[PDB]
Design a protein around this ligand. Structure first.
Ligand SMILES: Cc1ncc(COP(=O)(O)O)c(CNc2ccc(CCCO)[nH]c2=O)c1O
Ligand SMILES: Cc1ncc(COP(=O)(O)O)c(CNc2ccc(CCCO)[nH]c2=O)c1O
Lengths: 412, 417
């Protein structure tokens, strides 16, 4: 065992944190929408406004998910997915194929979002090889995107590695001229392109930007006409977050390949999935390799699959759309006051996502204590103060979150 | 819920398996309904049967499945904190595991980067090496060098250093089993001409797993360490398969008594409960990266340092260290040697080799799966031959009788070949 002080000592000496060098606050518990943190030697309750980075949609320690995990743990923790299959994987695959955009009928489980993106790339590349067009090996996307930290995933992240094709930043408002320009650029690269890869509707890590769903309809059309596969990365947007079950649903379009993760497991365990159409699967399967050449050690882990099944079932068994609509209303109302702030450039809400865009990078040394002082855990990045609250947050808790966000913006 | 029939129907229509097809599988997956200790419960011809997990579910299940201590560690952490973001927050599980790993790994490795899988941990190791040299003002050192027969995962960068059989990396010849100073001299010569271009050498120490279950004299690792130091190239050991006692030492590097600059671990890390991997580096590497223009290691997965995965790993590592694991492995190695001995005389058998809790029969031809599967299943053993290899890496908890059962099944496969 270790005291909060010993943890800090070990952490400072031995632990790499995300995108950091070699001060973290000690977290000692999580329950519902609340974290227990240690501040100045004292335990404090704070709202998990970030849902622990998009994951904890049902909050922490939900009895349904806890029990799903303990139930599976009693019977089978893990077995290899080579030559074996199991109920959690089958139940989850069945669910995912049923709730995702039409045509997505096969499921490849992996351990993280970055890996699922590379699997999606593998699918697209092997697809065209299966069609006898191995020259189609590049990827195209628009600027402002983020798809993970592995080397292939890095290649399609906003440039500001494989050399990929980048269209200009997709605007918030629909402009037919943007779609026309996108098509013209894609046209001259078509013989080079395996796929277009984008985050539908919401671009997260690249700057929490929202774009009109109509752009997705245009992409589907362009890709269809120029024979380029369309890949949607819904790792952040999936499972109700943007007001629809999957962001693609706002445009009513189905991609050829789709990545999901994060909220998939309710934030309990690492799991991701890459789905593709029957056409893609068969073409790869009929190809020279005769198979999709990927398969991680812990593929389709029974424990992760079991808790994911329960998380998805919990989500579908309630009126999630109304819940999200209520959250969106709460965020909008709560953030409105920020608009008039001198350092605030924009305020925007999309489903259970709320963003205050500031005129300068937000200083964590100031924002963090300001948020903690108000009983809220916020993690600003670049010039953004934002939140993606758990779906179980009450109106009062959303108000607490938004008022903390506003006071952070005010300090900037 | 689903019946085994419904599971197979769903599986066939909607599930990708590792390196497999949809609709074109010669052999359908077998339904697994339970796992406890060294045994899996599988559905054969509709009958539930118990079979030995001879592969430890790919090196992972070192304490067997559903070990009471590990189950408890998981449920204990589940009651308090399932997960929190590792950005700006830290927690006891991560700290306890980091402290443990820093203490039991080869000397010098005192920083720990957690990731969600082996392939990712390898990519992190690569990033560390590349950023290290950028921090030294030598961005030209960006390629990797390895020897053939290796395997390091299936993300695109990981693939580039896997045995060809992508970034174009530098490949030295297959390292031989027995120590030949000539091999090391030639390795040095090849590396020497690429030095200004090389960020790191990356290899599996002592045992190459997925690349063909080959063993090599640990002295080669001593040579690599020396070569790397003299030519200013970092050394990366991928111990994702060899770690935590598997080869008869706590880490395979310990056989050679050398310390890499960077090291990857995974698999047995969590006792095979959940996916978790870690990349460790020296203080020098960490400091050089932190002092560079970038000012930080530019990597950070959403689910980094998951409390549940860390908690079960702490229990698994503590369980291993709290017992005489070295003697357990020695006993396993002896049981494997005794059990596989009779295969040495089989017509189609080219080699029989054992290293710690690893047993391999190498044939002179490819192993037909349609012959091997029912043969092993009939004998209550789950085996996964590939190419010309029939092999096992059983859980450390296997009794002498279970080892006899496993080896007897392997020999029969070798006989049928
Ligand atoms: C769309 C999409 N595709 C792929 C991934 C990667 O999957 P992973 O391999 O499991 O990490 C992510 C998740 N990565 C991030 C999400 C959110 C932030 C916000 C805070 C930045 O400081 N930063 C991230 O890096 C994703 O959102
Ligand atoms: C040394 C080493 N370094 C890195 C990795 C990659 O880490 P991952 O990303 O967690 O896979 C591995 C992976 N080992 C295997 C991977 C896949 C199967 C097939 C399983 C079929 O059910 N069997 C494996 O042994 C590895 O051995």
């Amino acid at each position: 065992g270790l005291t909060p002080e010993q943890i800090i000592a070990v952490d400072g000496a031995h632990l790499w944190h995300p995108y950091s060098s070699i001060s973290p606050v000690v977290a000692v518990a999580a329950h519902g929408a609340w974290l227990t943190l240690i501040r100045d030697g004292q335990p404090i309750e704070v709202l998990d406004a970030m849902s622990s980075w998009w994951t904890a949609i049902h909050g922490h320690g939900h009895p349904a998910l806890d029990q799903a995990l303990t139930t599976q743990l009693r019977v089978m923790n893990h077995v290899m997915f080579g030559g074996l299959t199991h109920e959690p994987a089958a139940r989850l695959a069945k669910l995912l194929v049923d709730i995702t955009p039409a045509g997505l009928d096969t499921v490849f489980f992996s351990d993280s979002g970055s890996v699922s993106v590379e699997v999606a790339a593998k699918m697209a590349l092997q697809y065209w090889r299966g069609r006898g067009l191995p020259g189609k090996r590049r990827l195209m996307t628009w600027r402002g995107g983020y798809h993970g930290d592995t080397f292939l995933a890095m290649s399609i992240c906003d440039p500001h590695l494989a050399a990929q094709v980048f269209a200009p930043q997709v605007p918030r408002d629909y402009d037919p001229a943007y779609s026309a320009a996108f098509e013209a650029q894609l046209a001259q690269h078509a013989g080079e392109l395996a796929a277009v890869v984008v985050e539908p509707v919401v671009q997260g890590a690249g700057g929490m930007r929202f774009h009109d769903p109509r752009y997705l309809h245009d992409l589907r059309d362009i890709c269809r006409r120029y024979e380029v596969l369309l890949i949607f990365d819904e790792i952040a947007t999936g499972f109700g977050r943007t007001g629809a079950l999957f962001a693609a649903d706002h445009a009513g379009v189905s991609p050829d390949i789709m990545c999901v993760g994060k909220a998939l497991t309710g934030g309990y365990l690492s799991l991701a999935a890459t789905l593709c159409t029957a056409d893609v699967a068969h073409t790869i399967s009929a190809g020279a390799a005769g198979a999709l050449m990927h398969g991680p050690t812990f593929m389709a882990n029974p424990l992760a699959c079991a808790v994911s099944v329960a998380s998805v079932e919990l989500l579908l068994g309630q009126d999630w759309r109304t819940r999200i609509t209520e959250l969106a209303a709460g965020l909008t109302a709560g953030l409105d006051t920020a608009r008039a702030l001198p350092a605030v450039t924009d305020v925007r809400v999309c489903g259970a996502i709320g963003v205050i865009e500031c005129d300068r990078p937000v200083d964590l040394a100031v924002a963090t204590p300001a948020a903690l002082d108000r009983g809220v855990w916020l993690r600003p990045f670049r010039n953004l103060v934002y939140a993606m609250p758990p779906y179980i947050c009450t109106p009062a808790e959303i108000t607490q979150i938004t008022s903390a966000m506003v006071e952070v913006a005010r300090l900037v």
